[PDB]
Design a protein that fits this description.
This is part of a larger assembly, with 4 copies of chain A.
Chain A lengths: L10 H5 L25
Protein name (chain A): Major capsid protein
Family (chain A): Belongs to the Tevenvirinae major capsid protein family.
C-alpha cells in the first residue's frame, strides 16, 4: 500500500515537511498567533 | 491523530433482523460506530482538561492547615469553621471563587468562568442561594441535577457555566477559563476529517464490510504552562505529553471533594 | 388506594406476551463473559477504543502492579467502568488488594495522588494508514462494534 | 426498589440504607429540627439523580412514604432558605381524603 506517512509529532520534522512515508510536505501553515497581555 | 472502527456483520443476521423486527441493521451498526466515535472525542477533550489542569486548594489557593487538593465538607479547615451543611456548603463556593481568581492570576486573560463537576457537586450547588446571605439550603432548584436531559446544569451566580461529568471516577470538580476567542481557551480541538464511511464485502465468504475513519488533533495555547520566558530552542509542539502539560495548564484547576 | 400514578400498565395485546431489549455492544463477541455494553450509563466508554487503544495492548492495572512512568495501565471499575491511566510516578498498586473493591480503592487513591491520570488519544496516522495488512504490515485489525437483542417473558 | 442511602449516595461515616435523624453524619452536623429535618431533602435529591443515571432516562419524580416521613416534609420549608419549622401544613398528611400528599 502506498504510504503518505506522518511525523513523529516531532516539531522539527513537522516544520521541515518530512515524512515516515513517501509524501513531500509543504509545511505547516497557520494557526494564528498570540501575544502576552499588558496590565492594568 | 486518527481513529478507525468496523461493523463486521453477517448478512444472514441482518436478514433475520428484518424478518423479526423490521430492521436492516446497516444504519444501526453504522450509527453505533459513529456514536462511539463522537463519544470518544468528547471524552478525550474532557480527559485532557483534567490531565492538564492544576491542583486546586494548592499553593496560593491552599489554606496551610489543609490537605493540599481535596475539599472535605466535614473538615473545619475546609469549611472555614462552618457548622452544618447550611454553612459548610457556602464554604465550597468560596473556595471555587478563590480558584477562579487564581486562574486569572495565571492566564492573564480573565477569571475562571466555567466548571465541570460531578452530579453530587452540582446537587449541592443547586441546593443553596449562591449569593451573599446569612445561610442557605433546600431542595435543589438552581441547576439541572440530572444526566439525561442535558449536560449543562446552569450558571453559578450568573457567572460560571456549570456542566456535569457523568463519568467522573469518584467526585471532583474542575474550574477554568474560556476567553472570547477560540485561541483564548488554553485547550482546543482542531478537527480535520470526520466520520468517513467505508463499505464493501470480503470474497472469502462475501460477508459485508462496513466501518469509519477519522483524524483530528488537539492542542495547547503557547503560553498555557504560564511559567516560562522561552520554550526550548524556539520550537515546540502544542500537543500534550506528561512533560508538556501534566498538571501545568493555567486555564484550569481541579480538586477532589469529600463529605458531600 | 393509589391506582397507577407510580406504575406503568401495558395490560395486553394478547395475554402473557414478551419484551425485547436492544443492547449496543463491543469487543467482537456480543454474548460472552467479559462482553461490554457500549452505551451502558453506569460505566465509562473506552475513549481510545478506535484510537490508541486499538493501536496496542496495555498492561493491566492490578494488585502488585509496578507502575512504569509514561505507560498506560488499564482497568474496569465496579462502577464508572473503563479505565485508562497514564503513569506519572514509579509506584506499586497495593499487592494486598486481592479484593476487587480494594483494587478499585487503591486505583482511586493513586488517581487522587496524581500518580495515575485519565488519558485518551487517537493513534498515529501511519499506524492507521497501514492497518488490515496494508503494505505488508501485520497484527493490525480494526476494533469492532455491533448490537444484540434479547428478551424476557411473562405470565398472568 | 434498590437500597438507597448507598454507593455514591452514601457518605463514608453513615449506615448504608437508613437515614437516622439523630445521627450527626446523616444530618450533616445539623442541630435544631428547622435545619436537621432538611438534611433528608438533600439525600432525596441525591438519590433522585442516581435514578436518572442508572436508568439513563430521568430522575425521580415521585416519592411514596410513611406518614411519619410526610409529616416531616409537610412541617418544614423545603425551599431554599435559612431555616424553618412549624406545623405540618405543606402537604396533606391525611388518609381519609387522599393517598397523595402533594408535590414536594
Amino acid at each position: 500500500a502506498e504510504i503518505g506517512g506522518d511525523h513523529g509529532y516531532n516539531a522539527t520534522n513537522i516544520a521541515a515537511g518530512q515524512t515516515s512515508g513517501a509524501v513531500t510536505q509543504i509545511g505547516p501553515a497557520v494557526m494564528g498567533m498570540v501575544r502576552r497581555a499588558i496590565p492594568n | 491523530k486518527s481513529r478507525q472502527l468496523k461493523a463486521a456483520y453477517s448478512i444472514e443476521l441482518a436478514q433475520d433482523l428484518r424478518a423479526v423486527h423490521g430492521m436492516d441493521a446497516d444504519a444501526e451498526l453504522s450509527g453505533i460506530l459513529a456514536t462511539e466515535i463522537m463519544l470518544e472525542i468528547n471524552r478525550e477533550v474532557v480527559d485532557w482538561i483534567n490531565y492538564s489542569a492544576q491542583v486546586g486548594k494548592s499553593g496560593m489557593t491552599l489554606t496551610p492547615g489543609s490537605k493540599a487538593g481535596v475539599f472535605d465538607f466535614q473538615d473545619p479547615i475546609d469549611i472555614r469553621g462552618a457548622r452544618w451543611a447550611g454553612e459548610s456548603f457556602k464554604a465550597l463556593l468560596f473556595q471555587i471563587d478563590k480558584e477562579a481568581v487564581e486562574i486569572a492570576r495565571q492566564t492573564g486573560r480573565g477569571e475562571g468562568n466555567f466548571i465541570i463537576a460531578s452530579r453530587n457537586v452540582v446537587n449541592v450547588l443547586a441546593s443553596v442561594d449562591t449569593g451573599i446571605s446569612y445561610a442557605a439550603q433546600g431542595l435543589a432548584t438552581g441547576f439541572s441535577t440530572d444526566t439525561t436531559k442535558s449536560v449543562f446544569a446552569g450558571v453559578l451566580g450568573g457567572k460560571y457555566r456549570v456542566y456535569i461529568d457523568q463519568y467522573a471516577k469518584q467526585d471532583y470538580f474542575t474550574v477554568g477559563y474560556k476567553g472570547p476567542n477560540e485561541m483564548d481557551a488554553g485547550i482546543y480541538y482542531a478537527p480535520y476529517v470526520a466520520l468517513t464511511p467505508l463499505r464493501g464485502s470480503d470474497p472469502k465468504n462475501f460477508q459485508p464490510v462496513m466501518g469509519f475513519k477519522t483524524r483530528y488533533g488537539i492542542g495547547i495555547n503557547p503560553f498555557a504552562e504560564s511559567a516560562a520566558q522561552a520554550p526550548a530552542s524556539r520550537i515546540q509542539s502544542g500537543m500534550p505529553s506528561i512533560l508538556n502539560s501534566l498538571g501545568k495548564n493555567a486555564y484550569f484547576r481541579r480538586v477532589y471533594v469529600k463529605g458531600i | 388506594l393509589i391506582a397507577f400514578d407510580i406504575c406503568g400498565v401495558q395490560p395486553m395485546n394478547s395475554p402473557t406476551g414478551q419484551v425485547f431489549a436492544l443492547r449496543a455492544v463491543y469487543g467482537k463477541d456480543p454474548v460472552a463473559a467479559g462482553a461490554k455494553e457500549a452505551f451502558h450509563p453506569m460505566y465509562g466508554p473506552d475513549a481510545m477504543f478506535s484510537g490508541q487503544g486499538a493501536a496496542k495492548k496495555f498492561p493491566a492495572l492490578a494488585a502488585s502492579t509496578q507502575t512504569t512512568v509514561g505507560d498506560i495501565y488499564t482497568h474496569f471499575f465496579q462502577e464508572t467502568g473503563t479505565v485508562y491511566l497514564q503513569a506519572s510516578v514509579q509506584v506499586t498498586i497495593d499487592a494486598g488488594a486481592t479484593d476487587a473493591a480494594k483494587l478499585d480503592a487503591e486505583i482511586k487513591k493513586q488517581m487522587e495522588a496524581g500518580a495515575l491520570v485519565e488519558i485518551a488519544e487517537g493513534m498515529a496516522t501511519s499506524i492507521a494508514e497501514l492497518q488490515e495488512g496494508f503494505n505488508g504490515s501485520t497484527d493490525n485489525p480494526w476494533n469492532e462494534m455491533g448490537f444484540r437483542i434479547d428478551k424476557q417473558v411473562i405470565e398472568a
